[PDB]
Amino acid sequence: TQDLHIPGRLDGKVALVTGSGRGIGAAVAVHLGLLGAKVVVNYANSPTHAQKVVDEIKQLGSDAIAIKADVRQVPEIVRLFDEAVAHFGQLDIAVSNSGVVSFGHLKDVTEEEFDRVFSLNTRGQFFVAREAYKHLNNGGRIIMTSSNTSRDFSVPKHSLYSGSKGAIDSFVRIFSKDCGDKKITVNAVAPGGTVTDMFHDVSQHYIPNGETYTPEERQKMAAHASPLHRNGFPEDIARVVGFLVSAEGEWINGKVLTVDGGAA
Amino acid sequence: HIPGRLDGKVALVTGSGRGIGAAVAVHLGLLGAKVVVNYANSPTHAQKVVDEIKQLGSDAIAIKADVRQVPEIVRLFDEAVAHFGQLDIAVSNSGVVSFGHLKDVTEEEFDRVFSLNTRGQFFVAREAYKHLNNGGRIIMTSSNTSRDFSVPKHSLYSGSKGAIDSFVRIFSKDCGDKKITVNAVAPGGTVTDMFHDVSQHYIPNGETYTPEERQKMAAHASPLHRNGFPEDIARVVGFLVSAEGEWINGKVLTVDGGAA
Amino acid sequence: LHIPGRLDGKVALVTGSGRGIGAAVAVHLGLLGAKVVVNYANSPTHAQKVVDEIKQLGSDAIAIKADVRQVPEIVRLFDEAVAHFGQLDIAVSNSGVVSFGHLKDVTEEEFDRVFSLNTRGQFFVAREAYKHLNNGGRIIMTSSNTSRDFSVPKHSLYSGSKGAIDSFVRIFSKDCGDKKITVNAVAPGGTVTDMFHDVSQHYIPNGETYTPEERQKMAAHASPLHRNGFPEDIARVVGFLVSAEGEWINGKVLTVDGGAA
Amino acid sequence: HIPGRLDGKVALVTGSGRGIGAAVAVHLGLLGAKVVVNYANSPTHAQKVVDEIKQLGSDAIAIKADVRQVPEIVRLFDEAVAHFGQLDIAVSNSGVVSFGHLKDVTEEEFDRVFSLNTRGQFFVAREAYKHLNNGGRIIMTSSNTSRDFSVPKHSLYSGSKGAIDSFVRIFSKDCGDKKITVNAVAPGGTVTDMFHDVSQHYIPNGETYTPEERQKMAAHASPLHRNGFPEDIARVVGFLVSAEGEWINGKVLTVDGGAA
Ligand SMILES: NC(=O)c1ccc[n+]([C@@H]2O[C@H](COP(=O)([O-])OP(=O)(O)OC[C@H]3O[C@@H](n4cnc5c(N)ncnc54)[C@H](OP(=O)(O)O)[C@@H]3O)[C@@H](O)[C@H]2O)c1
Ligand SMILES: NC(=O)c1ccc[n+]([C@@H]2O[C@H](COP(=O)([O-])OP(=O)(O)OC[C@H]3O[C@@H](n4cnc5c(N)ncnc54)[C@H](OP(=O)(O)O)[C@@H]3O)[C@@H](O)[C@H]2O)c1
Ligand SMILES: NC(=O)c1ccc[n+]([C@@H]2O[C@H](COP(=O)([O-])OP(=O)(O)OC[C@H]3O[C@@H](n4cnc5c(N)ncnc54)[C@H](OP(=O)(O)O)[C@@H]3O)[C@@H](O)[C@H]2O)c1
Ligand SMILES: NC(=O)c1ccc[n+]([C@@H]2O[C@H](COP(=O)([O-])OP(=O)(O)OC[C@H]3O[C@@H](n4cnc5c(N)ncnc54)[C@H](OP(=O)(O)O)[C@@H]3O)[C@@H](O)[C@H]2O)c1
Ligand SMILES: Cc1cc(O)c2c(c1)C(=O)c1cc(O)cc(O)c1C2=O
Ligand SMILES: Cc1cc(O)c2c(c1)C(=O)c1cc(O)cc(O)c1C2=O
Ligand SMILES: Cc1cc(O)c2c(c1)C(=O)c1cc(O)cc(O)c1C2=O
Ligand SMILES: Cc1cc(O)c2c(c1)C(=O)c1cc(O)cc(O)c1C2=O
């Protein structure tokens, strides 16, 4: 009785999160800090935001650094991971989060748009996993980021993006087998509509007559997707990531968790 | 509010005198919940789980109820709420395993399995919905045999759990009117007396090996080269029934260490 | 000139083939050359119309009354089928009932009404099919796009009754391989039948506020092909699965809903 | 109209000089389609397929196009329509396999696989949609490794095909504006040079055994105790691309004989 159980702590662990200056990655980075991890905050374009995330993690009593790395470029992924281990001594947790959204009828999709989406969402994530396996401590954690659009929800004009995430679901199942030789688990989270810069950029494409409504209105209509009648927020996703990368999440391995509040 | 804790909440777990249910009950108590430990046949083991939850500093009571009988399910939930004043979390765990070729399955055997595994769980969820506080949690128990793994001579049991996977998806819609989340956990091979009872039927030529050899060979199913244990399942249930698990709703989480 | 997918010299049994999807399946298998056992429990005149259409097409059929909630009636149905045609190659488990209600309102009686036919009934139709079929035969079971693909409010009991079927067919394919029998399910979307008309109000948002005909027209927009599902759509897939050419689809649930959203 | 026939239709199959593509091409011709036989490397095999289809009484032409190159996909579809006047059915079949632990996968190997299996298939679907008559058919080619079977060291290929499963579901929505259905076939182990190239990677100590011995062992994956053959896949494609297949739309059909 002299012990109150504190579940899911990451004290003594080092995490890296791709694209953690903003949106879901930021909330993952802060949540892992809150749980006791030291955090490598990665950005490509948003150093102002990355600084605020670093400051937020230091403020709640952990440590953090920001490292610029364009995760479309494999040489920059190698450097990101090399710099992470040089700075903190080790790496236990890698969360592949960076991504871009796209909308377009099949007939209008160009080579350039296909390559813009796959280079980050699919190829970038793959090589983030590759470098994570190669740098992680035994018993570590790899997380990849999919979407409820890969399998559960079928949105018109969303083929390119949906396919970029469907690849991820397949990678994590096989990666769990390969990464077993270091006792590293590999899982994905597949968020539903989560209120971020990305959400506001494209919510008109998910709502039936979306272009005809205001952003605030589209957010309210998205809140009725869930039988809980609220939006998904970045912290909702971060909480699941925190469970999977904890010691206690070990027996969830090679799985894609859909985190959408039960959306219809 | 410590993240992941259940302080001030009340939980009920069917079949928590032993196996996975016992691990779930102790874990929810460890997280700060008061626990109703249901048993049908194992009163002594149930009291030991109660005494363990009290020793780690929470409260618990054992209530006898055969969850094949819907009137006993109603009475179990009525007595839970009467004792602790409220219920926030209901975990439907009780189940039985069965093996046999389609051609050999009797009406008696179909009824034995579906009455507990499927009908029983359905009416546990029904009484949970009716008794639970707003913002509460329902967990049902499936199996990685429902969808992920196709074992010969396992059709009755696999189908009994496949029904659960469908129930949770729709239950999340119905139960949203009380902001209750509904999920299932689908364990893989988890070391309990159920596991040891049928490990021969899951290992190729399993009758040919010893019980310890069957457990070692199951260990290699996971890329992590260990068996699943009741605690592994309990930890996932604990997360789902916490405030922090709210955005997992209407899902089946397969908890098998990445088994092949 | 190659004629694919024929069933000449084969014998098929379809449960609940007097009306709706079952009737379309029975007529389709007859058109492809199978002799057909038309099962009914309550609709003898409907069943005789189906037998008459199959004979008109150039095949042979009989109607056999059997309530497939009752395992003894299932045993008799299969014994009578083999006694009459000499053999059985194809068993299609189709009989079902729909149900709607919030979890909180579902009674023991309604749970038992639905599972006894939809789940237990189908299970024992498969059992007696395995025991009576020729080597190299076919079992088809009927699921629903509501088991996994769509999640409809107040539809838990029915959706679960069909999710059990999906698990059964996967494991049945293993057990039934020792007679080279393949086992699959079809999972229809909204298919225009008596059942469809009975419950379309519960699938369409504020369905009670529209006519049965209006509800049908609204369901036609679920598919990107902008038409309803019909019994024939489902019969066509069952016909491919029970053909020689369908052999390499085994242990699968095929969702047949025209791509519905 | 004869049930299941394609009289008066024109089909195009990528990679139809050999393997599964060749069986698809001959099967669509046997059913009454005129067939465009695409190859990139196998002109003499493509001509043998063309001569087979002419011999059974249909018409065919072989067209060289590397479907890694989107401008060559455009030209393939342009030349198909210019030759037969129309296109009704497009089967995206070309693919390559890859094995390697995640730690060993290069940029060059990722691009080799995704450029053909994922990007190439996507742009074949794009050009099919732009060239097809209303009421047409697109088929893409996945694998049972994308979802059903998790083979070690198979991540790059499995992911290449997992993208396909997502493409077909959304393509079915976009292509509905021309009443074109879009489906994938996901073969299991199917006896071709691809099968033989990696059957050692799907068997423990596989590198020991002979190729014929590995094929005999694979035949026991199915409860039907035979291998899958290209014809097994071609018959499913023939059904999906027929008038009678219309109500299967946006789906991935796993065609593996019930493999475990
Ligand atoms: N929001 C949703 O509803 C939703 C739903 C399902 C899935 N997702 C997925 O969840 C993940 C995050 O989404 P979000 O909503 O947070 O997106 P967001 O708000 O758009 O943020 C995108 C993040 O990705 C980073 N990023 C972009 N390009 C990068 C590059 N080349 N290299 C490294 N990092 C890069 C950005 O960093 P910089 O600003 O520094 O470039 C930014 O941190 C994505 O993978 C997305 O596909 C989101
Ligand atoms: N172990 C595995 O590998 C595995 C894998 C997948 C799924 N599961 C599932 O996980 C759940 C628990 O399995 P387990 O391994 O812990 O099995 P177990 O050790 O056999 O325990 C069975 C539990 O069910 C209870 N129970 C049995 N009949 C009951 C009744 N009529 N009313 C109320 N409770 C009843 C038992 O209580 P009494 O002794 O008091 O009867 C006992 O607590 C089951 O639903 C099982 O199907 C287990
Ligand atoms: N229509 C849809 O949208 C849809 C969608 C998905 C799945 N399904 C499923 O497809 C199957 C056929 O549905 P439907 O639309 O054709 O339904 P229906 O129009 O309601 O016809 C029901 C059939 O089931 C027979 N039946 C009922 N009780 C029976 C019993 N005790 N024993 C034997 N047969 C019995 C009926 O024969 P009697 O009249 O002789 O009793 C009748 O032929 C069902 O399993 C249904 O769940 C339908
Ligand atoms: N067990 C299996 O066989 C199996 C299982 C699951 C899925 N699959 C899939 O089924 C499909 C066919 O496989 P298969 O077994 O028949 O393989 P295969 O025997 O190796 O045949 C490969 C085919 O792809 C064509 N191809 C290769 N590169 C090409 C390019 N750049 N442009 C156009 N075409 C090209 C080849 O033509 P050229 O010789 O002219 O280059 C050949 O026709 C593939 O998508 C594969 O992933 C196969
Ligand atoms: C109801 C709804 C509204 C949205 O704005 C999104 C989504 C859902 C959604 O599922 C989604 C998934 C995704 O991978 C990226 C997104 O930007 C999204 C969204 O933006
Ligand atoms: C490799 C292995 C060995 C086993 O004994 C089991 C399993 C797997 C398994 O998946 C399983 C599922 C289940 O629902 C009940 C069980 O008793 C089990 C098992 O017993
Ligand atoms: C849009 C829509 C309208 C309907 O009437 C049904 C359905 C869908 C549907 O999916 C369905 C499934 C089923 O198993 C039985 C039904 O009666 C149905 C339906 O009746
Ligand atoms: C039992 C078995 C043996 C094999 O050789 C293969 C497979 C299965 C298999 O599934 C497979 C899938 C695939 O997409 C490509 C392949 O070359 C294959 C295979 O080669």
Side-chain angles (χ1 to χ4, degrees), chain D residues 44 46 51 55 66 84 149 203 230 239:
Chain D
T44 64
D51 297 340
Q55 276 143 12
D66 173 2
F84 286 124
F149 286 112
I203 296 180
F239 178 67

Side-chain angles (χ1 to χ4, degrees), chain A residues 55-72:
Chain A
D55 291 337
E56 192 167 351
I57 291 166
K58 290 176 163 193
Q59 167 69 54
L60 48 72
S62 200
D63 199 12
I65 56 161
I67 300 172
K68 188 170 192 178
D70 170 7
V71 300
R72 287 183 174 92

Side-chain angles (χ1 to χ4, degrees), chain C residues 98 143-146 155 158 188-191 195-196 199-200 203-204 219 222:
Chain C
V98 77
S143 181
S144 170
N145 73 166
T146 68
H155 207 32
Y158 178 80
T191 309
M195 188 181 281
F196 179 92
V199 295
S200 52
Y203 291 94
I204 294 170

Side-chain angles (χ1 to χ4, degrees), chain B residues 21-212:
Chain B
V24 168
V26 169
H27 189 69
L28 297 195
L30 181 71
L31 289 178
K34 298 185 176 174
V35 189
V36 175
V37 178
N38 162 257
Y39 69 95
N41 300 284
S42 301
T44 295
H45 289 140
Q47 190 60 230
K48 190 141 33 172
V49 170
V50 166
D51 292 358
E52 187 168 358
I53 294 165
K54 290 181 182 194
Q55 290 188 31
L56 54 74
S58 176
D59 201 11
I61 61 167
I63 298 172
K64 180 178 178 182
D66 173 4
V67 306
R68 294 190 170 87
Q69 301 287 324
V70 172
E72 293 198 36
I73 300 169
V74 170
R75 174 185 53 71
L76 165 66
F77 278 85
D78 285 342
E79 287 178 1
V81 169
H83 184 75
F84 283 125
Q86 74 191 52
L87 191 59
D88 301 285
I89 297 160
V91 181
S92 173
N93 161 86
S94 303
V96 291
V97 74
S98 178
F99 271 90
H101 192 289
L102 177 50
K103 72 191 169 170
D104 292 324
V105 177
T106 64
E107 291 186 67
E108 181 171 350
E109 184 63 3
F110 184 105
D111 290 342
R112 188 184 70 88
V113 172
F114 264 69
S115 58
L116 182 65
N117 288 3
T118 308
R119 198 172 181 278
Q121 297 210 68
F122 181 94
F123 285 108
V124 166
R126 191 196 72 183
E127 291 310 305
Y129 170 78
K130 288 161 66 186
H131 288 78
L132 250 49
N133 289 345
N134 288 193
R137 301 282 190 272
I138 300 175
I139 298 297
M140 303 178 82
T141 306
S142 183
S143 171
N144 71 172
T145 65
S146 69
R147 290 261 282 203
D148 290 355
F149 287 110
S150 296
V151 185
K153 298 192 222 315
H154 211 29
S155 61
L156 184 54
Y157 181 82
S158 299
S160 83
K161 300 307 190 125
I164 301 306
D165 296 355
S166 296
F167 286 160
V168 313
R169 254 220 343 288
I170 310 322
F171 288 174
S172 63
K173 297 208 155 30
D174 293 358
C175 298
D177 68 30
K178 289 178 78 176
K179 303 302 177 59
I180 293 168
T181 69
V182 186
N183 295 287
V185 297
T190 307
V191 181
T192 67
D193 293 352
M194 182 180 286
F195 173 96
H196 288 126
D197 194 31
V198 292
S199 60
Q200 68 267 23
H201 294 111
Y202 290 95
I203 298 319
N205 295 303
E207 277 96 18
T208 275
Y209 307 88
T210 60
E212 307 235 326

Side-chain angles (χ1 to χ4, degrees), chain D residues 16-35:
Chain D
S16 41
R18 58 200 186 87
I20 296 177
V24 172
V26 169
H27 194 68
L28 299 189
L30 182 67
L31 288 176
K34 297 177 183 162
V35 184

Side-chain angles (χ1 to χ4, degrees), chain C residues 15-23 39-44 46-47 65-70 77 93-98 117-118 122 141-146 158 161-162 186-199 203 229 231 234 256:
Chain C
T15 69
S17 44
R19 316 184 279 124
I21 298 176
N39 162 257
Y40 69 95
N42 298 276
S43 302
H46 296 85
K65 187 168 186 199
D67 172 7
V68 303
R69 289 190 169 92
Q70 299 301 320
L77 173 63
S93 176
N94 161 83
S95 302
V97 293
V98 77
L117 186 62
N118 285 8
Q122 294 211 67
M141 304 177 82
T142 306
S143 181
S144 170
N145 73 166
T146 68
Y158 178 80
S161 82
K162 297 311 201 141
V186 293
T191 309
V192 185
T193 68
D194 296 316
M195 188 181 281
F196 179 92
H197 288 130
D198 190 50
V199 295
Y203 291 94
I234 312 303
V256 191

